[PDB]
Every structure is written in C-alpha cells, then in structure tokens.
C-alpha cells in the first residue's frame, strides 16, 4: 500500500504535468492557428 | 518587391503549415499514451 500510495502519487503528479502540459499545447495551437490565419490573409492581399 | 515578399511569405507558410502537422501528430501521440496511462491509472486504484 505505501508503494501504491507513492506510485499514484506520481500518478497524479503526472496527470498534472499532462493536464497542465495539453492547456499548454491548446495554447501554442491556438497561436498556431492565428499566425496561419493572418499568414492566409496576407496571402490572399498579395495575390489582389 | 511584393513578389519577393509573397515568396518570402509562401516559403515561411508551407514550412508553417508542415510544422503544424507535425505538432498535430505528436499531441495525437501523447493523447494516446495519457489514455494508456489512465486505463493503467484506474486499475491500479482499484487493486489500491
């Protein structure tokens, strides 16, 4: 039980990291997406 | 000079857009690893 109990608290530690580490990404591919957008729209000007 | 920049802009937007994929690929990865991770997680709650 004390190993189990040390294991799922890295567990949890871990489904932090993860947690907290997919809002990062969401983050960095909602920044993504408004780059290609803007990068799309700059497109389209210079093809007018 | 508007060519120059649209070439310019083309060369960072293709490489862009191929990096994204990229980052897709690896968050579909890591999502499959974190349910692995749970399935394991929730077994090991249950023996606990």
Redesign the interface.
């Known amino acids: 039980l004390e190993k189990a109990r040390e294991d799922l608290a890295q567990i949890q530690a871990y489904i932090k990291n993860l947690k907290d580490v997919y809002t990062k990404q969401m983050e960095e591919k909602n920044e993504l997406e408004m780059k290609a957008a803007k990068t799309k729209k700059k497109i389209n000007t210079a093809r007018t | 000079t508007?060519n120059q920049?649209?070439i310019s802009?083309?060369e960072?937007?293709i490489q862009?857009?191929e990096?994204?994929e990229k980052?897709?690929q690896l968050?579909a990865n890591?999502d499959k690893e974190?349910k692995k991770?749970?399935q394991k997680?929730e077994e090991?709650?249950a023996?606990?």
């Open positions: 508007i920049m649209e802009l083309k960072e937007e862009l857009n990096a994204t980052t897709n968050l890591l974190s991770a749970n997680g090991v709650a023996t606990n």
